[PDB]
Amino acid sequence: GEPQLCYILDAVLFLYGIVLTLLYCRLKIQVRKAAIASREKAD
C-alpha cells in the first residue's frame, strides 16, 4: 500500500534522471564539438 507508491516514485525518478543525464551528455558533446570545430576553423 504505502511502500509501493514511493517505490514507483523512485523508479520513475531514476528513469527521468537517466534520460536527463543522457540528454545533458549529448548537449555537452555537441557544444564541445562545435567549439572545437569553430576554434580550429577560425584559428
Binding site: 511502500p3 531514476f14 537517466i18 543522457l22 551528455c25 558533446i29
Partner: protein
C-alpha cells in the same frame, strides 16, 4: 549518408552513455557488496552478486568507453580496432548480464510469490530491494547493449 554521416557525434554520445552506465553499475556493485552481503540472507536471491558480474561488467564498460572516447579524438589512429574489439566482447558481456538479470528476476519473482504479507521480514524486504536493483540494472544494461551494438556496427562499417 544516413549513419555514415550521423556517427560523428553519436559515437561520442554513446561512449559517454557507456561511461555513465558503467559508473552507476559499479556504484550498485560496491554498495550492495558492502551492505547486502551478509550470510543471513540466501544466495539464490543475490544471483548477480555471487559470480563477480557487477564489478567485471563495470570494468569492461569503463575501459571500452574510455578507449572509445580517446579514439574519437584521433589518437595515434590505432585505438579504433582496440575499441571495436572491446565493445565486441562487451556485447557478449552484456548478453551474459541480461541472462543473469532475467534469471535473478524470475528467482525474485518466485521469492515474492512465496512472500505473503508483502515484506513481512528482512528476507522479503531485501528481495524487493534486490528486484528493484534488478530492474535498474536491466534498464542500464539495455542502454549499454544498445550503445555497444551501435558502436560495433558503426566501427564495422568504417573498417570495411
Amino acid at each position: 549518408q544516413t549513419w555514415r554521416t550521423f556517427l560523428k557525434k553519436e559515437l561520442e554520445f554513446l561512449g559517454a552513455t557507456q561511461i555513465l552506465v558503467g559508473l552507476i553499475c559499479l556504484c550498485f556493485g560496491t554498495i550492495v557488496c558492502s551492505v547486502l552481503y551478509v550470510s543471513d540472507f540466501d544466495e539464490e536471491v543475490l544471483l548477480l552478486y555471487k559470480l563477480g558480474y557487477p564489478f567485471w561488467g563495470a570494468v569492461l564498460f569503463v575501459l571500452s568507453g574510455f578507449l572509445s572516447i580517446i579514439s574519437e579524438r584521433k589518437n595515434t589512429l590505432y585505438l579504433v580496432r582496440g575499441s571495436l574489439g572491446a565493445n565486441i566482447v562487451s556485447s557478449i558481456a552484456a548478453g551474459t548480464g541480461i541472462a543473469m538479470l532475467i534469471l535473478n528476476l524470475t528467482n525474485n519473482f518466485a521469492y515474492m510469490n512465496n512472500c505473503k504479507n508483502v515484506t513481512e521480514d528482512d528476507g522479503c524486504f531485501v528481495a524487493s530491494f534486490t528486484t528493484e536493483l534488478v530492474l535498474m540494472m536491466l534498464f542500464l544494461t539495455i542502454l549499454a547493449f544498445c550503445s555497444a551494438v551501435l558502436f560495433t556496427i558503426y566501427r564495422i562499417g568504417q573498417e570495411l
